[PDB]
Design a protein around this ligand. Structure first.
Ligand SMILES: C[C@@H]1CCc2c(sc3nc(SC[C@@H]4CCCN(C)C4)nc(N)c23)C1
Ligand SMILES: C[C@@H]1CCc2c(sc3nc(SC[C@@H]4CCCN(C)C4)nc(N)c23)C1
Ligand SMILES: C[C@@H]1CCc2c(sc3nc(SC[C@@H]4CCCN(C)C4)nc(N)c23)C1
Ligand SMILES: C[C@@H]1CCc2c(sc3nc(SC[C@@H]4CCCN(C)C4)nc(N)c23)C1
Ligand code: NA
Ligand code: NA
Ligand code: NA
Ligand code: NA
Lengths: 396, 396, 396, 396
């Protein structure tokens, strides 16, 4: 039961484990695309004597954090332990080794998408974005007078086949991800994959259409089994105008009863309608999870709210350091210290705070975060707040 | 088709309209309780030649706003137009008259609970609290190590019959409502009503039990039809300790599969569990709606975030005034002006901002709120933010 | 946190815990009936400093075992730990104390009905009867030619109000329980309770009717919500003729689509129909659980199959003794020994074997039961087999 | 409307009837596989003047009966009457002719799988195996301490692609079927078919995986529509160790909520868990049906329980003979006689008794089986009992 980097011979074994571990697995043809995003020495396998009974890897990603600052991010993925080798501490050992490598390679953060909400807390990962399903009953939907782009004259939105407008989708998404906390650089091979899923599959998903605006796009498809439901796979808008225009176009799908979209809690769509309530929140879940690999590097990289005055404190991260933290002018200086700690938290808690998705007040109230001073709590709430609302890019 | 204050003779007519308009109506025995909360000249009826074809009233309420400041609040309720007299502008006329009276009586705000999410925007009401259903699968629920009150020794929570501990429930709720934005004074007659619904009803609801803590209580009942579901009617906790203790006790209902509760978005319960995801958000809806009756009176009454520096602007409310607004030291001075407006909004939008439930960034993005300066937007977001999270007291 | 026999003052506290612990609880009016079946010193309570936070008791029952032998049986019931006092070893301590008393009082067995299938194994209880739901689609049901009581001339079955024929129901059930493994003496107060549930309850259950035969009866009611479903609460038949006659009468409920009954795996009803498959098994569950309190006393009391030759062995019960077991002539002699054990099992396993519901082959295959000799396994299978199929009397 | 053996020209007609009669029909490509198992003169067709309006055949099978004795078995299959030719006694005539041929060819038994539970009784077929669906909620499943193969060190179970381990599956199944009542020799062409269904089908079933042990295997696939459900198509285990090991591996499918398997009533899986009840029986049905073609030949071929003493009787089979039956030493001698019958039954009843699935007590109680002597009933129960529990091989 040894732990190594895989050789070319180990990959077929890994694809077998993958097919049996993940029900959304696509196959070797398509795993060869994603494989380009794994750096040399980005993968571990566990062999038994030999069949692969365990695997984990990371991908080289670019995460946009508050302040439009882009960080190199180890994206943990393809983690799997054979059902034959459960409760063997095989995950513990693989996660421990990839964390050594990610840290030594000089990634300040790692991120993942959690198959379950209870595995990853203990390895230092915190839920850091929030997924929000909105289902609109579009038969009753009337736009408010205050809504943009409701004057007469031509629409600036077009209905198009996705594949004939790759260039414009790449351009818009590139602008978007650079300016939104949670944004990820989407490499050529992931666009290749996105547009292969646009096409109708024999007894699978139906054709995907596109609403294209100069500063926005929406991909959507009719649900396989519910033919009055349109599922918006992805809506990226750079301007409020583009966002409204596209939603005008979606409410326009007159043969549909319901528009469905996975979006973020601050999505303005309910405020565009005369009836806020027609945009019902049907489902909510943790999106992206962060492990802060280097506390000073990460706290120093991001922007902070200008609207909170300058202030100083001592932050302890359980088994991850103690730091003089000083914040003003939306910059933070973070330096070693042995001064008495004023605030304490496990490293997962920092992950959750880091993109402004969760308030320190909220985590303090659960005692996930300790301080005696409730003024310092108000000051952290305010500073870590993200002016631009945090969103989730793509799952990996 | 005349509009008057009702006489004693008009009430039976109103109770008939009530029974046919509201499916949760309880009956004259119980409408005589609530009637004590209606002030003289707090009711209008519309007679046809005579049967009551329309009615509306307000109740004298005390709403707690940010800064632990308590405001006299006209609580609009018992609004109904006969199905025989729809699309007759009968609501428009009743709302217009009660608004004259509320304003002349010197209420700074009115509030209501909306049967539909699209009626009340046009009368100046904004959704100002957010209801959040959490359903916990309590068979998997393990409290985090960080969670309070998980040392050995006796529990400070008791299982009790609600009716034998009215005094302690009144005491705790009194402390609670005084310290939480959204808090309402609950008068004797509404406690009378709450505890009449505690008892099992023949082929109705099942017995209600109580978990009592020195600084918290939870009322809960098993669902009529789903006997693995416990419905938490009401949980009030003054301390984080009390909140955790009570949830420890609810996860302890071992014969239940699921605990259900209508709570607020900042409820810390998911952070108390090793798996955040076990606390699934199953339903979301607008809670309390506010109409700001007097813009200067209201902006001046509430506290604002100390963590935003002093700043000044000109706010216009569409057909509700234009004001020099100056905010610093968590106080606001609000005075008439004809200076060019820097920010504009309909009066409903102010209602939504007023308890800190909705960010001005979010409403700006929908163009419900107009400014050219995105620094001023950040400053409003920050100032109107409520340090203590806003909650919903009881429906009326 | 002390453990005592309750005083008269402790009972109201216990009824509160009961109402909050059991959703089928009926109330003090009706708990005073069952209380007559609890002997002096048959109850324990756990007080905290004082509110009852834990309770358990047994009832004096008479269980019929193979050989038509009737045993005094401690019926464990009304077991409950407050949700405020979970994971406090409060059950462990209450079960330990009642087991001391039951054993000292000279009960050879204890029995219970398990709210969950995973609590009671570790206290020495084994699932010993099997509940079997049969749902008949009675629109297709044709009796086989071989079926009894299908000649012309009058029926010997009558449709009657249950309450007007208590005497005949008592008589038939008395004959039944004396001749069937799993049979329990039903005392006057439990007949009182059975017939109080016969009557329709306002927005509850519907009227219960009775099909009465000289040697059998069936109580049945139409389902509250599904009006094409008849639920057979109880069918007791002493003769195969009585059993067939009653089923002829139930298939005769022409306004019903489906007859539903909780019965045993060897119920002959499918063999009475031309289509065995119309009697679909819709649900299966452990019925009565036994703890063998005294291994020699119990093994010696029951009859064994005459059709297996005489044979001898050494049985070890993990922490419950080691015995020379000799079986022939359907009697067993069971005496102490230090001779090497030939077969081993935890005490719960013996409970399961004891009424012939579970084969020792089946438990051996799971390694719940150890022997090197598969001939001895065949001999236990054969001996412990019950010629009359084992059934479940009433739940307590 | 004539009855003949089909010619090569008749087959296309039969495949058309097949497609319209059976919804699981695969097509001519695959019917050419199964056709190898039909002997010359094993098929009848009914032509109308000519289109095939009726067909029936048998296949040459090897059935394992108690005593590990393997019998040549006519497997009735592909029986169909056009919807245009119902209630024409076309089945009666086809069944009559195939029964002549099967009997003359010297098959002692015939078997079938019944599309409905009420057609085949009248042609002498008895339900002789019992199918049992177990659904495990694997999130709660904890193996008992008594369970095998729960020490540390490597697992002896492997996750593998079925197609790369045909040889080992054939070997294990061969051992299995030779030692289990209900066992059928699986010929090369049926393995060909089994492994063609292993592969994912476009908008059909998902990939099938394999858990392989030295003495056991399990094939399983994720359900098409319910992605938290794993359906175990087939689990064959020769040793109790192999059976436990494989179930440990299946409980290990951590991304699944439920494991589903069609198994037999004596499956030991519930006894392997600390909670017996987690293995819920979700569905039950008649499996294999037997027609005893030659009563003496068949009664003489099988083994009987050694644990019942020697005994003699006279058995009458309604229109199938009367026999001196003598049983001792687990052998039976069965010879003609005109001595007064002591026990009587239709021939279908014998079919049901023959593999020990159904107790003669149970069939006697329905009066499907007549005797005056209840000691003789106990002796038949005991003798016909199968020490190794009877199972169902594959459907045909
Ligand atoms: C070696 C590469 C690494 C990652 C990788 C593949 S295929 C593939 N497909 C996908 S599809 C996205 C879902 C979302 C949630 C988690 N699931 C695993 C998948 N993702 C990968 N990371 C990959 C092979
Ligand atoms: C004259 C008084 C005025 C208000 C009043 C009654 S009865 C009563 N019952 C209730 S119960 C609460 C639900 C919640 C949502 C809106 N529904 C109307 C009811 N409420 C009242 N305001 C009242 C008579
Ligand atoms: C002090 C006596 C002891 C037992 C007792 C009562 S009320 C009552 N009602 C019932 S009703 C039967 C269900 C079946 C499964 C388990 N549940 C608890 C109930 N049973 C009792 N033992 C009792 C009070
Ligand atoms: C001439 C041969 C005879 C039997 C045969 C085929 S195809 C085929 N496929 C199948 S698949 C198994 C199901 C199970 C229940 C009954 N159904 C009929 C099918 N079976 C056959 N006997 C056959 C052609
Ligand atoms: Na998001
Ligand atoms: Na709220
Ligand atoms: Na039973
Ligand atoms: Na079977």
């Amino acid at each position: 039961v040894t732990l190594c980097s895989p050789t070319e011979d180990d990959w077929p074994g890994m694809f077998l484990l993958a097919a049996a571990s993940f029900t959304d697995f696509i196959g070797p043809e398509s795993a060869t695309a994603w494989r380009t995003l794994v750096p040399t020495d980005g993968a571990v396998v566990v062999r038994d004597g030999s069949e692969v009974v365990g695997m984990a890897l990371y991908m080289d990603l670019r995460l946009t954090v508050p302040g439009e600052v882009v960080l190199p991010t180890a994206g943990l993925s393809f983690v799997a332990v054979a059902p034959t080798h459960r409760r063997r501490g095989l995950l513990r050992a693989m996660c421990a080794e990839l964390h050594r490598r990610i840290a030594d390679s000089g990634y300040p953060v790692a991120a993942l998408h959690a198959s379950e909400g209870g595995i990853y807390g203990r390895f230092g990962y915190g839920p850091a974005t929030t997924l929000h399903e909105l289902t609109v009953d579009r038969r009753f939907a009337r736009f408010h007078a205050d809504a943009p782009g409701g004057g007469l004259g031509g629409s600036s939105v077009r209905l198009v086949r996705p594949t004939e407008h790759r260039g414009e989708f790449e351009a818009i998404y590139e602008r978007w991800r650079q300016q939104v906390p949670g944004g990820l650089l989407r490499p050529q091979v992931l666009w290749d994959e996105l547009l292969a899923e646009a096409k109708a599959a024999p007894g699978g998903d139906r054709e995907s259409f596109a609403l294209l605006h100069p500063d926005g796009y929406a991909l959507y498809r009719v649900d396989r089994t519910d033919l009055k439901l349109a599922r918006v796979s992805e809506l990226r808008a750079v301007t409020a105008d583009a966002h409204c225009a596209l939603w005008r176009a979606l409410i326009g799908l007159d043969s549909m009863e319901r528009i469905s979209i996975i979006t973020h809690p601050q999505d303005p769509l309910p405020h565009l309608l005369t009836d806020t309530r027609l945009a019902r929140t049907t489902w909510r879940q943790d999106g992206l999870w962060l492990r802060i690999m280097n506390v000073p590097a990460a706290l120093e990289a991001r922007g902070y709210a200008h609207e909170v005055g300058e202030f100083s404190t001592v932050l302890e991260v359980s088994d991850g350091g103690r730091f003089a933290l000083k914040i003003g002018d939306g910059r933070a200086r973070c330096t070693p210290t042995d001064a008495a700690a004023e605030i304490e938290m496990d490293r997962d808690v920092l992950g959750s705070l880091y993109l402004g998705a969760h308030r320190a007040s909220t985590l303090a109230a659960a005692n996930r975060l300790r301080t005696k001073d409730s003024q310092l709590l108000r000051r952290l709430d305010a500073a870590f707040a993200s002016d631009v609302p945090v969103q989730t890019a793509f799952e990996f």
